[PDB]
Amino acid sequence: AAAAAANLNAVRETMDVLLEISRILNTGLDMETLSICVRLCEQGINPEALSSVIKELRKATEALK
Amino acid sequence: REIITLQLGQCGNQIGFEFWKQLCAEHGISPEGIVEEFATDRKDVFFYQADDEHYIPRAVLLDLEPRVIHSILNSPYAKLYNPENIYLGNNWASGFSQGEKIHEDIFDIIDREADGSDSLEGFVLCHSIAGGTGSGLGSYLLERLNDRYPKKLVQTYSVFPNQDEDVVVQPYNSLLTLKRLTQNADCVVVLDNTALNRIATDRLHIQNPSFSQINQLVSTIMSASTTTLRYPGYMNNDLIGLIASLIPTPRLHFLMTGYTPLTTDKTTVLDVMRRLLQPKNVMVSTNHCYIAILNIIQGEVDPTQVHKSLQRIRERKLANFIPWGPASIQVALSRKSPYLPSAHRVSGLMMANHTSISSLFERTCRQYDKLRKREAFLEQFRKEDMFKDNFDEMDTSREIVQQLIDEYHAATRPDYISWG
Amino acid sequence: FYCKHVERQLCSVWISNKTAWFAGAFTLRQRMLNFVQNIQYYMMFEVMEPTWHILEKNLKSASNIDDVLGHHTGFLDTCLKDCMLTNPELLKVFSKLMSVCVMFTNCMQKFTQSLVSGFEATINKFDKNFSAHLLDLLARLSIYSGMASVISRLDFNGFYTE
Amino acid sequence: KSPNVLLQNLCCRILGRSEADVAQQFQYAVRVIGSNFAPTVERDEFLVAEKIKKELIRQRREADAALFSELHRKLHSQGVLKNKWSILYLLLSLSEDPR
């Protein structure tokens, strides 16, 4: 509709403001990855579990290089 | 003959509400429609002699996101007109598409009232240009009315969208609506919102309730323009006669509004004629020249006064002429209405075809051209994209309004065997 | 009544001719309707209403019937004689112009095709016939013995002055 | 979707590779995320905001610590995120010290 795309505006906003929070804490996640990271959190998930996976995948892109 | 008045949008239902209240107070009727004892007249122009001894006006009630229309509902003037035909925004594309999907039963509503009256003269549309609610649906209904009935007249009382304004799609909406106005209407009466705003902030010191006071102005003008139809004269007891002289050709059908008192809250015809001819008693504010003017006066008029006043108007030359022909200000006399307030006993109004409205058109065209060149002010409205993914209607409307400006400038010339 | 009949015809042409060919009949129709409407404005608001309002002052201040009889006869005789009715040669150009009006509106109502040049040629033939007689009217009335009122009503710009 | 294949999307996003090119890393993702779906520790967004400000003072990005005061407000202003706490703890956990 029209308001049903205004909610799509309000999600792209969430995604951008969490990227500003992402750069000031200096994490490696970019915009495209952060859009996966918000989707996972809607079902509910441990950040303590996700951080070790991300801290391994960033340690396995130059070791699988 | 008989006029069926159409009102739509919140602004259009507002001006129709105030106009119906004005004609209720003017003629001898109650807000229920109860006959008075003082009422050469006619009560069959906007009014049907309806079937509970209330002169119920033939009005099409259309609502789109109703807020003020709810206030029209719980009102003593809802006992004057309600033939029970109320049927359900901020964009031209949304109102156009919403009017498109339901054209059938609202056309049946139009057909019901068309069968309602014995005769018909025209369709007067209470319309607001780029008003959001009126916009789009009004242009689509204009296409439906002019296509479905080619034998009648279409009138559109219109405002010019400049209210010292946020909406940036407003030039696109006004441009598309103006394309419909040029192509799908026989005559258009245009007013400026900024002009009436200046006049209102002049005569009083109001800043906030400007809308309602502007409504008073347009309702008084609409009553004044159809006084010669509602009260039997000798000419312009039909719409087409008043429409005929001002409009020389099907492209120049846009009329300026004048009315010589700006006051109702001693006088002669001679003074109000010279007071009318200035462009600051005009309620619409290079060589700029009128095509044709027509003035209608109502009051205690000595018949020699219009004669020598027109003498003075000639040898003073205080009116802008037409090169290619004679088409000049015409003196019309009408009856003073019963139960109108006794200020400005000799009072006149004018309707005129002027080339100066081309300036306002090209200003709005320049605003559209700016926002269109920048390409950041379509806002990606979803109805605007789905209605036209290529947006070629904006180009077609720009071409039509450019041809309109060229024909205006060509009519300005002493040769109008050169066209545009 | 004849002058009202032609007004109905001339308005009908403009409303039907707008379809949602030529501009040669646009200016011809603008010179016909804005002729006949102004004969009404003159013929009423100078002859009829002034003298009728004075005749209401004759029906308050006159003490006998052989005044009122003469006043009434004078109003009727002037409301004929100051117009084209009992004019001695009638100003016959008025009947001729009205004939060109009725022929023009008859042809212009057949604007529907199913030759555009044949319509254009007969409209221009009418245009010659009309414009000549309009100038002949202005001349013939200007020589006849009140003139400037109806002349300034008919043209104000002076696009034609003869 | 399902969260198991959505985690495979995350494994395509961090790395620069296709999913038939590597299956080891997605196996590390499913082994760590698995048999746990619900936080068993303290839940409050307010405390993790007071842990993000405390961390930005420690890194002397104290003007960015007044930026986070606006960004958390913007996060509340949209209001379409179900758990605000999980992503704040996640973004806090991956924090680097460039000083």
Author numbering:
A (entry chain o): 11 to 75
B (entry chain O): 3 to 41, 45 to 93, 101 to 177, 180 to 279, 287 to 306, 313 to 447
C (entry chain A): 646 to 665, 675 to 768, 814 to 844, 851 to 867
D (entry chain n): 7 to 105
Task: Give the authors' words.
The gamma-tubulin ring complex (γ-TuRC) is the principal microtubule nucleation template in vertebrates. Microtubules are formed de novo in a process termed nucleation, which is spatially and temporally highly controlled by γ-tubulin complexes, composed of γ-tubulin1 and associated γ-tubulin-complex proteins (GCP). Here, we used cryo-EM to identify and characterize γ-TuRC assembly intermediates after recombinant expression of the complex, which allowed us to delineate a comprehensive stepwise assembly pathway from a stable 6-spoked core to the mature 14-spoked γ-TuRC, identifying successive stabilization and conformational locking of γ-TuSC units as central principles in the assembly process.
To study the impact of inhibited actin integration on the structure of γ-TuRC, we replaced full-length GCP6 in the recombinant expression system by an N-terminally truncated form of GCP6 (ΔN56-GCP6), reconstituted γ-TuRCΔN56-GCP6 and subjected the complex to cryo-EM analysis. During computational sorting of cryo-EM particles, we identified similar γ-TuRC assembly intermediates as for wild-type γ-TuRC, but unexpectedly also fully assembled 14-spoke γ-TuRCΔN56-GCP6 complexes. We obtained a cryo-EM reconstruction of fully assembled γ-TuRCΔN56-GCP6 at 7.1 Å global resolution, which was highly similar to the wild-type complex. However, as expected, actin was not incorporated into the γ-TuRCΔN56-GCP6, as indicated by the absence of cryo-EM density for this component. While the MZT1-GCP3(8) module forming the basis of the lumenal bridge was structurally identical to the wild-type complex, no cryo-EM density could be observed for the first two N-terminal GCP6 α-helices, as expected. Notably, all three α-helices of the GCP6-associated MZT1 copy were well-resolved, indicating that the first two N-terminal GCP6 α-helices are dispensable for stable folding of the MZT1-GCP6 module.
